[PDB]
Design a protein around this ligand. Structure first.
Ligand SMILES: *[C@@H]1O[C@H](CO)[C@@H](O[C@@H]2O[C@H](CO)[C@@H](O[C@@H]3O[C@H](CO[C@H]4O[C@H](CO[C@H]5O[C@H](CO)[C@@H](O)[C@H](O)[C@@H]5O[C@H]5O[C@H](CO)[C@@H](O)[C@H](O)[C@@H]5O)[C@@H](O)[C@H](O[C@H]5O[C@H](CO)[C@@H](O)[C@H](O)[C@@H]5O)[C@@H]4O)[C@@H](O)[C@H](O[C@H]4O[C@H](CO)[C@@H](O)[C@H](O)[C@@H]4O[C@H]4O[C@H](CO)[C@@H](O)[C@H](O)[C@@H]4O[C@H]4O[C@H](CO)[C@@H](O)[C@H](O)[C@@H]4O)[C@@H]3O)[C@H](O)[C@H]2NC(C)=O)[C@H](O)[C@H]1NC(C)=O
Ligand SMILES: *[C@@H]1O[C@H](CO)[C@@H](O[C@@H]2O[C@H](CO)[C@@H](O[C@@H]3O[C@H](CO[C@H]4O[C@H](CO[C@H]5O[C@H](CO)[C@@H](O)[C@H](O)[C@@H]5O[C@H]5O[C@H](CO)[C@@H](O)[C@H](O)[C@@H]5O)[C@@H](O)[C@H](O[C@H]5O[C@H](CO)[C@@H](O)[C@H](O)[C@@H]5O)[C@@H]4O)[C@@H](O)[C@H](O[C@H]4O[C@H](CO)[C@@H](O)[C@H](O)[C@@H]4O[C@H]4O[C@H](CO)[C@@H](O)[C@H](O)[C@@H]4O[C@H]4O[C@H](CO)[C@@H](O)[C@H](O)[C@@H]4O)[C@@H]3O)[C@H](O)[C@H]2NC(C)=O)[C@H](O)[C@H]1NC(C)=O
Ligand SMILES: *[C@@H]1O[C@H](CO)[C@@H](O[C@@H]2O[C@H](CO)[C@@H](O[C@@H]3O[C@H](CO[C@H]4O[C@H](CO)[C@@H](O)[C@H](O[C@H]5O[C@H](CO)[C@@H](O)[C@H](O)[C@@H]5O)[C@@H]4O)[C@@H](O)[C@H](O[C@H]4O[C@H](CO)[C@@H](O)[C@H](O)[C@@H]4O[C@H]4O[C@H](CO)[C@@H](O)[C@H](O)[C@@H]4O)[C@@H]3O)[C@H](O)[C@H]2NC(C)=O)[C@H](O)[C@H]1NC(C)=O
Ligand SMILES: *[C@@H]1O[C@H](CO)[C@@H](O[C@@H]2O[C@H](CO)[C@@H](O[C@@H]3O[C@H](CO[C@H]4O[C@H](CO)[C@@H](O)[C@H](O[C@H]5O[C@H](CO)[C@@H](O)[C@H](O)[C@@H]5O)[C@@H]4O)[C@@H](O)[C@H](O[C@H]4O[C@H](CO)[C@@H](O)[C@H](O)[C@@H]4O[C@H]4O[C@H](CO)[C@@H](O)[C@H](O)[C@@H]4O)[C@@H]3O)[C@H](O)[C@H]2NC(C)=O)[C@H](O)[C@H]1NC(C)=O
Ligand SMILES: *[C@@H]1O[C@H](CO)[C@@H](O[C@@H]2O[C@H](CO)[C@@H](O)[C@H](O)[C@H]2NC(C)=O)[C@H](O)[C@H]1NC(C)=O
Ligand SMILES: *[C@@H]1O[C@H](CO)[C@@H](O)[C@H](O)[C@H]1NC(C)=O
Ligand SMILES: *[C@@H]1O[C@H](CO)[C@@H](O)[C@H](O)[C@H]1NC(C)=O
Ligand SMILES: *[C@@H]1O[C@H](CO)[C@@H](O)[C@H](O)[C@H]1NC(C)=O
Ligand SMILES: *[C@@H]1O[C@H](CO)[C@@H](O)[C@H](O)[C@H]1NC(C)=O
Ligand SMILES: *[C@@H]1O[C@H](CO)[C@@H](O)[C@H](O)[C@H]1NC(C)=O
Ligand SMILES: *[C@@H]1O[C@H](CO)[C@@H](O)[C@H](O)[C@H]1NC(C)=O
Ligand SMILES: *[C@@H]1O[C@H](CO)[C@@H](O)[C@H](O)[C@H]1NC(C)=O
Ligand SMILES: *[C@@H]1O[C@H](CO)[C@@H](O)[C@H](O)[C@H]1NC(C)=O
Ligand SMILES: *[C@@H]1O[C@H](CO)[C@@H](O)[C@H](O)[C@H]1NC(C)=O
Ligand SMILES: *[C@@H]1O[C@H](CO)[C@@H](O)[C@H](O)[C@H]1NC(C)=O
Ligand SMILES: OC[C@H]1O[C@H](O)[C@H](O)[C@@H](O)[C@@H]1O
Ligand SMILES: OC[C@H]1O[C@H](O)[C@H](O)[C@@H](O)[C@@H]1O
Ligand SMILES: OC[C@H]1O[C@H](O)[C@H](O)[C@@H](O)[C@@H]1O
Ligand SMILES: OC[C@H]1O[C@H](O)[C@H](O)[C@@H](O)[C@@H]1O
Ligand SMILES: OC[C@H]1O[C@](O)(CO)[C@@H](O)[C@@H]1O
Ligand SMILES: OC[C@H]1O[C@](O)(CO)[C@@H](O)[C@@H]1O
Lengths: 624, 624
């Protein structure tokens, strides 16, 4: 195995385990020390203000299995430290008949058992498990554990009657899934249900959703309410909160609802961030975020979605969440978004970015799989004075519109997402920052124009504001991770409303994914403006390319160029002319970002292991 | 619930959990502190000379499940002390995917991993498990753990390739079972295989048998050999050691071989005890002990058997154990005999005595189930100068015969069993001993004649030698646990050769078993004698009645009389006349025996618990 990145790549499948550990590896974001990771879990802000982040983890393997909670903490979402205990960086693992098949996703009750932070998680046991299989009751249950040492360790309740698991009965027959309990407080839901509590007897201050669906009949989000305040064993099923149809789609801006939900959460937001009012705040909007499966031809059959909802109270003392409008949380190779409350009226969301090596060709050579997205503040994005002539505006697909009294302008409301300011500040302050002169793209514009300052490695951020004519047919954007022979092109095409990432040339290594990524972006045209603007922020972090547009649209993807000098960046231009010009301003390169794991050495591999011939006998885990 | 034992029993099913804890409970033998126990396991003599005894254990339940090793130790087989650690008296429990369904029986490698005592045990996982079900490979595997603190705790090898489980591949298809690894050293087997080791490459000093069978085709004992001395991961399958037919029986003296073996062991004995020669000792005999299932209409479908075997070497470098003669280790309500080596050339055997409450009517009220037998020295019983006119002598069913040169006498060889002398000495020395005058049973003999001294409680031993005429039709024996209305009758009937325990009147409580127990006993008649003698030793210990005849025949059973004064004992006589007399001598009562668990209070119940509705969902354990 040759690791010469000045010449074409050889046959990299001949390379040893973890020989490509550092080659494509993110440095500026949350990632496990080694091995397999997937969904974020157990997220909470601790008593000292620091952030505890858990994740689905399988150390010393590069496929899923024996799934456990790995964990770390940070005071700023940005620089992290691993927990280190008797099981390394794991803090919860399969150990009991009820969870031996995997400690799946869970969420935090901050004041739980004996006043301690408490996780409610999906405890899995034996049997077929999956939305396309014939799962039975008991295979997925919900269990509690609590921590007396701020997340260094967790103590499970005992196995048995009146103890773990605490939720085991299926609320309906023939479920496609029954997992990912999301526990939350809600003055809103409490006020709505206050007149019906004699019907159900559930009066606790915590609610919990469980994600799933019904065979042949679409996805379901099931709502439970803690039966009694201060008591954590009894959870009363109220009813289905969200009910969608079998592979139902709200349209081109909304993905597809698939057959089964995963990692669903419930929040309430206003323009500033999180809202904890009882309904009295007329600027607040109720949201559900959720993954769907088997409604997509690619991206591992997975859509990470969100919906604004209007709650209705049922006669049986339950809640129907009626979808008002419906969007996409990230359009690329990410999934399993979790959100959690943060002090100062914030709700922060983070997901998992999978690799683009679906045939598992170089996973062993990597010695790891997966990373997080950046941490994102959620809020209600409000755009004022929108022109009624904005194309497609009254479809109200993933936004709402409200006319002015005179009908000459519109207020647009949608879900806002932006990178947490702590990370933006730390990234910029630790980088070599180059503020670039504005560039007018016209008839003289080359297809690709390198920036006047260049990155020095695969760890950088770009900002730019692209001003387009209202009837443009020009395309513009950013090329990143670029040499002569390898590059990744990020294009926006206002005429089609499509933001694309073209990866046909991303790498000389042919085994990685190369499909074109696509997001829809609505440029809301402002009354009196003679142009429309796209504000792009792009993070390049090893192999991760994470794109944010207008504090609204996110697209995470992967690129794995082999050559050491495929690190360049610049402007892309297509169909720009003397008449159809694209004005680029607010241009900035942040070279270096932050070393997110300062205590870790460059290579944190501990080698890879095989479970042996029993893995195929048990049939639960791949075994490697 | 009334506990008045001076009047007839009420409806005892109304009694609370463990309200009958002390009522019927043995005091003088090995028993768990509370809850369910079954098979002995992990038996070894520790470096300090003390005995470590493990047992299959399910605390705070009265049916089998989550099966674990409970443990205790003793310096004399008789007075015991519990281990106490983080899991109470447990020292190995289900904790890994490979053993989460139960830590089944295992045996000890005294110099194992890093020189420490090491257990090889059956690690069970999910799936149908049983001789009458369709079991698959992986459900039962064999795994290692070792102890650095003389049995207070055990450390399992890791899960994976080249680690646990160490034996997982089925040696043939469609096994009825694959469990109970019995590890042993054998100079005998080493010498037999020494010329064939190039064929298999297995040259280690430890052998292991695994108990099972083949669907439709009878039981099997599979032989493995440690591949390399001092290395414990690799065990090479040689071949089947014992092969028997589907419900094959060697006859009336030999039980039935059923469909599947359990808890099989291999030993070599001579007249003094254990033999460790390479074949050169012409007085030594090779034995296998084993349980069989589904060859019996009652006694939980279970026979605890033994066979003398002659080893033949196969061309493929394996061993066939050809059965020479075949007997019964205990004729009553016991099973799962384990044997282990003890210093001074001894092999000691101990089994499990189950209750006689098969419909589980009063188990919760007991708050426990099960005890051990007494510990027994095994040896080759040799009877010299046997008369050729002994009825049935040349059937050679569960014994061998060798004629003298002149044909006028015979030497009989069989398996000997006797209670370990440490226990006999301790019992006698701690008891109030009454030496009773000989009693001649003739025409004046009543049906029942109380002993001149009586027991004071349900903890005593009786000895007696019964001298019968060679053509007698009289019956005699012992009545125990006797008042006017409740009693248990132990009869021997030389004409039929049957030792019986009649339990039609054992208790006023009708829910307990009342079937007549039966053992065959051959009184080998001595040349020149005008009579034949039965030496009986009987232990009464709470509800256990354990009978030994002529250091050969054992019969364990249960009796649960309600009345406080059902403690008496005496002689039984039937058909004794002036001409057909039974001379009883060597009569002795030992009243009290030994307090076997001096540190335990009278009531060691910790209550009983229910696993809850998930027990039926998982389908592995009853749940209570
Ligand atoms: C099959 O068999 C399995 C094995 O038996 C079985 O699993 C076991 O289940 C039992 C029963 O559920 C579990 O027992 C519980 O344990 C909890 C503690 O768990 C943590 O700590 C233990 C012990 O840790 C010691 O030992 C280990 C090992 O050596 C060390 O590593 C530790 O450092 C520690 O060492 C010290 O102590 C030792 C002695 O104990 C010393 O020897 C040593 O020198 C040290 O000083 C760990 O073993 C646990 O690890 C395991 O589990 C974790 C997950 O939790 C895994 O990640 C890990 O890998 C291991 O598998 C773990 O870390 C106890 O809290 C719990 O006791 C409470 O509940 C019971 C039942 O309800 C009560 O009776 C009891 O009174 C306790 O409740 C009180 O306390 C809590 C809070 O403290 C209150 O919330 C509660 O209301 C109550 O309060 C009472 O007291 C108050 C006074 O303060 C009073 O105010 C109140 O009014 C009230 O009275 C219970 O003991 C056991 O852990 C499992 N073991 C394993 C290995 O899995 C399995 O379930 C079975 N399966 C089936 C299908 O049946
Ligand atoms: C799914 O995930 C699961 C969780 O990850 C996973 O289970 C885990 O598997 C791993 C991998 O197999 C297990 O790790 C092994 O652990 C063995 C020790 O096990 C005992 O001790 C641990 C740790 O005990 C500490 O912590 C607990 C908990 O707090 C305390 O109770 C203890 O008191 C103790 O505390 C002290 O130390 C702590 C830090 O560790 C401190 O924080 C603390 O303050 C104290 O000071 C226990 O947790 C174990 O309990 C569990 O398991 C038992 C059964 O064993 C259960 O009954 C119980 O309920 C628990 O479940 C247990 O008691 C290690 O020995 C082992 O390490 C050896 O092997 C590895 C791999 O081969 C080697 O890399 C390593 O070097 C070690 O080998 C060397 O040493 C041995 C002998 O010591 C030699 O034989 C060997 O040749 C080698 O020698 C080397 O060193 C020599 C120098 O001396 C040199 O001469 C040689 O040349 C050579 O170099 C390994 O770490 C882990 O225990 C499992 N955990 C659990 C909870 O189950 C599961 O498998 C996964 N499932 C699937 C399907 O994938
Ligand atoms: C004395 O010891 C016992 C442990 O042995 C302790 O716990 C009790 O254990 C018994 C089993 O021995 C449990 O009985 C079973 O209960 C089932 C119904 O449970 C629900 O109702 C009861 C009664 O109101 C409630 O107390 C339970 O509440 C507890 O459990 C829930 C979880 O569900 C917790 O949230 C609570 O906090 C409590 O812990 C329940 O709400 C019942 O289905 C089951 O019935 C089967 O068995 C009986 C008896 O054989 C039959 O009559 C019946 O027809 C069913 O038969 C089954 O038989 C076979 C084999 O199982 C199957 O194949 C059949 O199809 C059929 O299903 C049983 O009665 C009891 O619930 C439990 N009590 C607890 C935990 O409180 C006692 O506590 C202990 N006492 C003391 C004072 O310490
Ligand atoms: C680098 O990391 C790996 C962990 O990823 C470490 O361990 C190796 O891991 C790989 C899997 O990634 C193992 O490969 C598998 O090996 C199977 C055959 O094993 C036996 O032969 C090999 C080769 O001589 C021996 O080394 C093994 O010895 C070890 O295991 C035994 C227990 O069996 C122990 O006793 C020893 O001590 C050793 O620990 C074995 O004797 C093989 O069956 C399996 O093949 C499948 O997969 C490949 C690749 O995809 C296919 O080509 C093949 O057709 C099979 O495909 C399967 O694919 C699907 C999904 O699984 C199924 O549905 C199909 O039906 C089909 O079965 C695979 O090749 C490797 O054995 C293991 N090596 C070990 C433990 O030594 C490396 O050690 C590590 N390297 C370093 C230097 O650290
Ligand atoms: C019944 O027990 C008696 C008493 O132990 C046995 O007779 C004794 O046997 C020992 C050992 O061989 C001799 O040393 C004694 O001299 C014998 N005592 C006698 C005859 O009173 C007798 O062998 C046992 N019988 C059976 C059938 O097991
Ligand atoms: C790369 O090496 C593998 C062995 O890992 C081989 O099977 C494959 O065909 C090779 N690819 C080539 C020669 O293009
Ligand atoms: C309440 O009613 C809704 C709508 O019919 C139903 O889906 C839900 O299951 C009901 N809740 C119950 C039965 O607890
Ligand atoms: C909103 O404004 C547009 C443009 O003025 C108009 O076509 C539409 O009918 C208005 N909707 C309402 C509800 O008044
Ligand atoms: C660099 O990053 C660290 C870690 O996130 C941060 O705390 C620090 O403020 C940053 N340095 C700056 C902004 O100068
Ligand atoms: C980058 O490296 C390649 C391969 O070594 C080389 O051919 C090329 O000249 C270098 N520069 C660019 C911008 O491609
Ligand atoms: C004994 O009590 C049980 C309740 O535990 C009852 O069902 C049974 O019929 C009673 N037996 C009688 C009255 O003989
Ligand atoms: C050795 O031969 C015997 C008798 O045919 C057979 O049962 C056993 O399986 C063989 N051993 C092997 C194949 O290892
Ligand atoms: C053994 O002795 C009996 C009685 O003398 C005789 O019938 C039988 O044939 C003898 N057996 C042998 C092998 O000599
Ligand atoms: C009584 O029993 C104890 C415990 O087994 C034993 O050590 C002691 O020797 C016995 N006392 C005697 C024989 O006097
Ligand atoms: C034993 O107790 C019962 C019941 O109290 C009583 O009737 C009888 O007289 C007593 N004695 C005997 C030997 O049965
Ligand atoms: O099914 C009963 C209830 O369900 C619906 O959610 C309606 O909002 C409510 O008006 C109705 O009474
Ligand atoms: O930011 C702190 C927030 O988190 C807490 O978990 C509560 O649910 C919420 O009421 C509080 O405002
Ligand atoms: O199958 C081969 C071998 O098996 C048998 O056990 C015979 O004892 C032996 O003579 C024969 O050669
Ligand atoms: O009694 C001690 C005996 O036990 C040991 O485990 C050996 O297998 C045996 O050779 C030795 O004589
Ligand atoms: O690792 C298992 C976890 O991953 C998810 O499937 C989402 O990808 C969750 O639904 C589940 O809890
Ligand atoms: O508890 C399980 C154990 O009990 C037995 O079935 C014998 O009764 C063994 O074969 C097994 O190892």
């Amino acid at each position: 195995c040759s690791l010469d990145q000045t010449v074409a790549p050889g046959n990299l499948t001949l390379c040893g385990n973890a020989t490509l550990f550092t080659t494509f590896r993110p440095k500026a974001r949350f990632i496990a020390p080694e091995g397999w990771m997937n969904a974020p879990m157990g997220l909470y802000q601790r008593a000292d203000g620091s952030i505890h982040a858990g994740y689905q983890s399988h150390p010393k393997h590069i496929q899923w299995g024996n799934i456990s909670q790995g964990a770390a903490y940070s005071s700023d979402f940005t620089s992290w430290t691993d927990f280190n205990g008797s099981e390394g960086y794991k803090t919860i693992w399969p150990s009991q008949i009820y969870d031996i098949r995997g400690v799946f996703d869970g969420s935090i009750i901050k004041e739980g058992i004996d006043g301690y932070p408490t996780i409610l998680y999906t405890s899995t046991s034996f049997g077929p498990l999956g939305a396309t299989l014939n799962e039975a009751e008991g295979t997925e249950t919900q269990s509690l554990a609590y921590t007396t040492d701020d997340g260094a360790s967790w103590i499970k309740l005992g196995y048995g009657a009146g103890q773990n698991p605490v939720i085991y009965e299926w609320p309906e027959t023939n479920l496609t899934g029954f997992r990912d309990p999301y526990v939350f407080q809600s003055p809103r839901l409490e006020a709505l249900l206050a007149n019906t509590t004699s019907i159900t007897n559930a009066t606790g201050d915590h609610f919990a959703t469980i994600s799933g669906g019904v065979h042949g009949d679409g996805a379901r989000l099931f709502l439970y309410r803690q039966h009694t305040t201060g008591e954590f064993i009894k959870w009363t099923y109220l009813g289905p909160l969200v009910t969608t149809g079998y592979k139902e789609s709200y349209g081109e801006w909304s993905g597809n609802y698939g057959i089964n939900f995963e990692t669903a959460g419930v929040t309430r937001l206003n323009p500033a961030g999180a809202a904890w009012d009882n309904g009295s705040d007329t600027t607040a909007v109720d949201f559900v975020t959720f993954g769907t499966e088997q409604g997509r031809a690619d991206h591992q059959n997975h859509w990470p979605l969100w919906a604004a909802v209007d709650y209705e109270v049922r006669d049986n003392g339950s809640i129907e969440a009626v979808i008002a409008y419906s969007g996409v949380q990230d359009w690329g190779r990410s999934y399993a978004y979790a959100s959690f409350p943060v002090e100062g009226y914030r709700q922060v969301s983070v997901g998992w970015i999978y690799e683009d090596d679906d045939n598992v060709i170089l996973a062993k050579q990597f010695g790891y799989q997966g990373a997080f997205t950046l941490f994102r503040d959620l809020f209600v994005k409000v755009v004022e004075n929108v022109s009624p002539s904005t194309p497609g505006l009254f479809e109200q697909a993933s936004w709402s519109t409200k006319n002015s009294t005179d009908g000459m302008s519109v207020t647009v409301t949608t879900l806002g997402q932006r990178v947490v300011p702590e990370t933006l500040a730390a990234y910029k302050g630790n980088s070599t920052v180059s503020t670039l002169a504005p560039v007018m793209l016209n008839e003289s514009a080359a297809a690709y124009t390198p920036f006047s300052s260049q990155p020095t490695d695969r760890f950088y951020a770009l900002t730019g504001s692209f001003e387009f004519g209202l009837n443009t047919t020009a395309k513009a954007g950013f090329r990143v991770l670029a040499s002569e022979e390898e590059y990744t092109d990020i294009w926006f095409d206002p005429a089609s409303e499509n933001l694309t990432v073209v990866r046909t040339a991303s790498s000389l290594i042919k085994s990685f994914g190369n499909d074109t990524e696509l997001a829809k972006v609505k440029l809301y045209e402002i009354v009196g403006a003679e142009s429309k603007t796209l504000n792009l922020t792009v993070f390049v972090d090893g192999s991760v390319i994470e794109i944010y547009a207008n504090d609204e649209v996110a697209l995470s993807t992967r690129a794995y160029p082999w050559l050491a000098n495929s690190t360049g960046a610049g402007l892309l231009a297509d169909g720009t002319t003397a008449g159809d010009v694209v004005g680029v301003s607010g241009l900035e390169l942040w070279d270096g970002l932050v070393d997110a794991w300062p205590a870790r050495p460059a290579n944190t591999s501990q080698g890879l292991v095989w479970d042996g011939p029993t893995a195929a006998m048990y049939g639960l885990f791949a075994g490697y």
